[PDB]
Amino acid sequence: SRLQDKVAIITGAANGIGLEAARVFMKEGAKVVIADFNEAAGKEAVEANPGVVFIRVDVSDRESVHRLVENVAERFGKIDILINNAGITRDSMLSKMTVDQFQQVINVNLTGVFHCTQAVLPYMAEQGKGKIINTSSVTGTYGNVGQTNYAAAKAGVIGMTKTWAKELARKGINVNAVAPGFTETAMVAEVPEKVIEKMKAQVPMGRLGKPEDIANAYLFLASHESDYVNGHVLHVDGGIMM
Amino acid sequence: HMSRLQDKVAIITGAANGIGLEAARVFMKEGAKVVIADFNEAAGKEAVEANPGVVFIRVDVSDRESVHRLVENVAERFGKIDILINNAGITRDSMLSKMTVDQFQQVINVNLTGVFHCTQAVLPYMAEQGKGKIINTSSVTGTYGNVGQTNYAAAKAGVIGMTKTWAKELARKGINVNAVAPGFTETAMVAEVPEKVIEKMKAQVPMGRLGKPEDIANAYLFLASHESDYVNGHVLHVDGGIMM
Amino acid sequence: SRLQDKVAIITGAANGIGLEAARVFMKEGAKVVIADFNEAAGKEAVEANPGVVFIRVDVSDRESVHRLVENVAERFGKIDILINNAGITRDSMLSKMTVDQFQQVINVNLTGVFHCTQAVLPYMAEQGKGKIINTSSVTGTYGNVGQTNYAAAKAGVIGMTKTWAKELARKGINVNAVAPGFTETAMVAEVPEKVIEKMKAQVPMGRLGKPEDIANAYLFLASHESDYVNGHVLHVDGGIMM
Amino acid sequence: SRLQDKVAIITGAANGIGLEAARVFMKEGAKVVIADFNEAAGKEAVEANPGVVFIRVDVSDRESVHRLVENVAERFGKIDILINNAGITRDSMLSKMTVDQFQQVINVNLTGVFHCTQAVLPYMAEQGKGKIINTSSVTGTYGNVGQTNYAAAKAGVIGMTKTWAKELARKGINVNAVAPGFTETAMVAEVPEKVIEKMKAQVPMGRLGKPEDIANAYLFLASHESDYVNGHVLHVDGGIMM
Ligand SMILES: CC(=O)CC(=O)SCCNC(=O)CCNC(=O)[C@H](O)C(C)(C)COP(=O)(O)OP(=O)(O)OC[C@H]1O[C@@H](n2cnc3c(N)ncnc32)[C@H](O)[C@@H]1OP(=O)(O)O
Numbered sequence: 015s016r017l018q019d020k021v022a023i024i025t026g027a028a029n030g031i032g033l034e035a036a037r038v039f040m041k042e043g044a045k046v047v048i049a050d051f052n053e054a055a056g057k058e059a060v061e062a063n064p065g066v067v068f069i070r071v072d073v074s075d076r077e078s079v080h081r082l083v084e085n086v087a088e089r090f091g092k093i094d095i096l097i098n099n100a101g102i103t104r105d106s107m108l109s110k111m112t113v114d115q116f117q118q119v120i121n122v123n124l125t126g127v128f129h130c131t132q133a134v135l136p137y138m139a140e141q142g143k144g145k146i147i148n149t150s151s152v153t154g155t156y157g158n159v160g161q162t163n164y165a166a167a168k169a170g171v172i173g174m175t176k177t178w179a180k181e182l183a184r185k186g187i188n189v190n191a192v193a194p195g196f197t198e199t200a201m202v203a204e205v206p207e208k209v210i211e212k213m214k215a216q217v218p219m220g221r222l223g224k225p226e227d228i229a230n231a232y233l234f235l236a237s238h239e240s241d242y243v244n245g246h247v248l249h250v251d252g253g254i255m256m
Numbered sequence: 257h258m259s260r261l262q263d264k265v266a267i268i269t270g271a272a273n274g275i276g277l278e279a280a281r282v283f284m285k286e287g288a289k290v291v292i293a294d295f296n297e298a299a300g301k302e303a304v305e306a307n308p309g310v311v312f313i314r315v316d317v318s319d320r321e322s323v324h325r326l327v328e329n330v331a332e333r334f335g336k337i338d339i340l341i342n343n344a345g346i347t348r349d350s351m352l353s354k355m356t357v358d359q360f361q362q363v364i365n366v367n368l369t370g371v372f373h374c375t376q377a378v379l380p381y382m383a384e385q386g387k388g389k390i391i392n393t394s395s396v397t398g399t400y401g402n403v404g405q406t407n408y409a410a411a412k413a414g415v416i417g418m419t420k421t422w423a424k425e426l427a428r429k430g431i432n433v434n435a436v437a438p439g440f441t442e443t444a445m446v447a448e449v450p451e452k453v454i455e456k457m458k459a460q461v462p463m464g465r466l467g468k469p470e471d472i473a474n475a476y477l478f479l480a481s482h483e484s485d486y487v488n489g490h491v492l493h494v495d496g497g498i499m500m
Numbered sequence: 501s502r503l504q505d506k507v508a509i510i511t512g513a514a515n516g517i518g519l520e521a522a523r524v525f526m527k528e529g530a531k532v533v534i535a536d537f538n539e540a541a542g543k544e545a546v547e548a549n550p551g552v553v554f555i556r557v558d559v560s561d562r563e564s565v566h567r568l569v570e571n572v573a574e575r576f577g578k579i580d581i582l583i584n585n586a587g588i589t590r591d592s593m594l595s596k597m598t599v600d601q602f603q604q605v606i607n608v609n610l611t612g613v614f615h616c617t618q619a620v621l622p623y624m625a626e627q628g629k630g631k632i633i634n635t636s637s638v639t640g641t642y643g644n645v646g647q648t649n650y651a652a653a654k655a656g657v658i659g660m661t662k663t664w665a666k667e668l669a670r671k672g673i674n675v676n677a678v679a680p681g682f683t684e685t686a687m688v689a690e691v692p693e694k695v696i697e698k699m700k701a702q703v704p705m706g707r708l709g710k711p712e713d714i715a716n717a718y719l720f721l722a723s724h725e726s727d728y729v730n731g732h733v734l735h736v737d738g739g740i741m742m
Numbered sequence: 743s744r745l746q747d748k749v750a751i752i753t754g755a756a757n758g759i760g761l762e763a764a765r766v767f768m769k770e771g772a773k774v775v776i777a778d779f780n781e782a783a784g785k786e787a788v789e790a791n792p793g794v795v796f797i798r799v800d801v802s803d804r805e806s807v808h809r810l811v812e813n814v815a816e817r818f819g820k821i822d823i824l825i826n827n828a829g830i831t832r833d834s835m836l837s838k839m840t841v842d843q844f845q846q847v848i849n850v851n852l853t854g855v856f857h858c859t860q861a862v863l864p865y866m867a868e869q870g871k872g873k874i875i876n877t878s879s880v881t882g883t884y885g886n887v888g889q890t891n892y893a894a895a896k897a898g899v900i901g902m903t904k905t906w907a908k909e910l911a912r913k914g915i916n917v918n919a920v921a922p923g924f925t926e927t928a929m930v931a932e933v934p935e936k937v938i939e940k941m942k943a944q945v946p947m948g949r950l951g952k953p954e955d956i957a958n959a960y961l962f963l964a965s966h967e968s969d970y971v972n973g974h975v976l977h978v979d980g981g982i983m984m
Pocket residue numbers: 347349350351394395396397402403404405408439440445446449
């Protein structure tokens with residue numbers, strides 16, 4: 015199998031894209047650690063998918079991340095794949111956005127990616143092998159009304175991805191990003207039915223993404239089938255016009 | 257290997273050598289019915305001998321009549337065309353100051369117009385099926401430019417413009433259209449440079465190596481399979497993170 | 501004057517964007533040669549703008565281009581600026597596009613840029629200075645339904661631009677491109693008004709480009725104020741969503 | 743006098759690129775406010791460039807920023823142009839980068855841009871006109887070894903730029919970014935001569951940028967000559983290969 019015996023930490027994997035990625039990765043032979051702040055959802059994933067491991071983490075909290083990685087290393091002795099998939103939104107027009115809304119999103123969606131990647135790095139470096147996959151967004155690449163903070167963070171993730179691809183290549187580590195288009199998860203759940211049709215109208219394929227579509231891109235970037243893909247932003251967005 | 261392309265009919269242009277040949281092999285292992293479509297008869301025949309189950313049909317992608325002969329033959333034999341990979345390509349390198357009109361036009365004819373001919377030829381089959389995958393081979397030279405390659409850069413960048421247009425036009429027909437931009441990859445196309453300049457292009461790749469045909473073939477497989485169904489209008493770089 | 505005594509060849513300058521660029525460049529002190537196939541429009545430009553020079557050219561015809569450049573060189577002794585602005589559209593859905601429609605647009609919009617640039621190059625190389633400005637399009641960068649051929653050509657122009665920036669830098673020559681968004685010229689005059697509103701709807705600024713807007717970008721890229729801009733695609737598109 | 747009587751706030755303008763932009767803008771008729779924390783350099787700029795105004799600001803301090811903007815509005819009655827040019831580096835390989843280094847750079851180079859833009863916005867919205875120019879970097883667009891934090895911030899600036907172009911367009915405000923290549927300022931000063939040659943080797947033009955080159959791009963994006971340029975990242979990098 016494509017990920018046989020590989021240990022994968024997937025942040026934000028108690029729900030949505032990350033949860034589906036956990037399942038896909040398990041089907042491909044990986045040992046999967048769901049690292050998520052949502053305990054109830056995490057425990058539900060454990061019950062639903064025999065063999066998956068759940069460890070509670072707040073990716074914005076460096077101590078929490080340190081504990082996560084130590085825990086995984088103690089259990090499995092290695093960390094082969096990190097998917098930085100955890101994210102939040104705190105949408106507001108620029109004219110109304112509070113510092114708290116801005117900083118919260120930076121903390122989770124940008125700094126959290128920094129924390130998790132720094133924490134796994136010494137394990138991958140020792141192994142001389144690793145895959146890091148960072149979740150950006152079409153909002154990061156193209157901008158989006160009401161998302162100053164989320165765009166800042168998701169674009170920032172790309173800058174880090176490109177830097178790390180350059181820094182870590184000599185260590186046998188691949189670093190890439192995925193830019194999902196609008197995808198049917200809880201993150202889209204609270205948007206009005208009206209804007210949903212507008213979002214679909216911007217996609218020539220005429221549909222939103224599914225968690226499985228994005229999980230499939232994570233799988234490509236985590237497997238040997240992408241070994242010469244490095245520093246790339248893989249869009250999975252239906253060809254959205256944005 | 258899996259069976260991700262089970263019973264899918266794939267035409268891969270330029271598949272008698274290099275990246276295309278490896279893609280033919282990978283696609284066969286994944287269950288596809290593969291047609292190698294290449295101008296090089298001898299290489300095509302050798303590929304068939306070395307890879308039982310593969311079909312070779314000679315084509316010149318720059319010649320529209322040749323392209324229609326190819327596609328009608330594939331349709332007659334297999335009844336459908338699920339995947340087209342526009343992988344055939346040539347180089348006729350020259351500094352701008354010395355480049356002849358023939359060098360420019362030959363590369364446009366094969367690397368740009370040929371992609372147009374093949375895509376137009378397969379389109380009615382895919383439209384009737386309500387499904388299809390088109391994968392166009394661009395290059396880091398198309399995205400970034402490269403000294404001595406005015407013509408090849410024009411063609412490979414042009415391929416991206418067509419890819420993005422087709423992704424918009426054809427999505428409603430159930431067709432995905434994407435491009436791959438390989439970095440420098442170990443094939444005959446690269447073998448014609450001094451190993452001293454090989455280190456130079458290698459030095460621009462943080463991974464410290466050139467691509468292998470299998471690397472590019474693996475990206476073709478991703479873009480041809482259901483695992484990339486929501487990838488559309490995208491240029492997938494397989495270039496080791498090259499600085500260009 | 502930003503272009504004082506600079507000799508500028510502007511292809512396609514008998515109408516539209518190129519005509520306004522000719523006027524803008526004249527105001528900034530340049531000696532301007534309008535090179536266009538439309539003889540009547542060219543002669544009209546000469547009458548309306550005392551001092552402009554018109555030389556008929558078909559940019560797709562190499563011999564025509566060589567006569568143009570010989571004529572300019574014999575007359576002014578130098579060529580400082582080339583703007584490859586001539587272009588045509590022959591739109592069709594892929595399913596219906598003829599080889600002739602495809603090839604004509606390639607001939608003018610892609611090969612013509614090759615011809616003109618190759619012809620001016622020896623002059624710029626001998627002087628150790630020059631500015632080449634190539635006109636691409638948002639259709640080249642983003643694709644556009646009905647424009648397989650135009651997108652091929654305009655994207656191809658970007659590939660050549662980047663190649664030439666690398667090749668010619670050592671000769672003291674800057675090479676850049678402009679990607680106009682939808683702009684009010686004869687090229688848009690044939691689209692239905694309903695489509696005009698659709699085009700505008702994609703532009704957050706809520707208006708189309710003016711010939712002067714694009715001419716202003718040509719001026720920037722032709723002047724010393726862009727001496728360290730090289731190999732760049734300058735979008736003048738109102739932030740169009742495409 | 744392309745900027746005649748326009749009020750421009752240029753953050754970080756006590757030194758380097760910003761200082762040269764202050765000088766260029768004054769020459770073009772602008773009323774320039776240098777906003778910088780470096781008091782000795784700011785005062786020197788005033789003495790050396792009569793007509794310029796210096797107001798002390800720390801862009802990472804929201805209160806300091808609001809005092810700045812209130813001061814400018816009270817004195818000049820309007821704010822026409824904001825250049826978010828202030829920036830710092832705190833370089834380190836990922837393996838050794840501290841949270842302090844990461845956060846300091848985010849605070850100044852990303853959050854500071856948010857603070858300054860939010861603060862000027864109500865004035866530009868009232869005027870129905872304004873120009874916002876954000877300074878990114880080739881490190882943000884391409885990544886650079888040792889610059890995880892700076893790449894995150896400078897890429898994030900592009901995300902915000904694109905979002906703001908979309909949000910603010912119909913208010914008569916242009917929002918664009920500049921991505922300078924390596925440029926001769928104090929930011930590059932303590933780079934070894936051997937590494938300087940390495941950077942030059944990646945630039946086909948064979949030289950680093952000058953502060954005047956970047957200032958000229960700021961001038962383009964601040965003037966009416968770029969009124970239809972929106973949401974664009976203007977590279978001024980000599981065609982660097984990165
Ligand atoms: C990229 C893909 O998608 C697949 C491909 O095409 S495979 C490889 C791509 N092709 C290439 O890179 C070009 C290969 N051919 C060449 O390089 C040859 O130089 C040429 C045929 C273009 C010209 O030959 P030539 O007229 O004899 O000029 P030549 O003496 O070789 O080189 C002149 C200068 O340009 C430089 N140069 C040439 N090709 C270059 C390149 N690709 N990149 C950077 N510099 C280059 C050389 O270093 C040389 O520098 P100097 O003057 O300081 O010595």
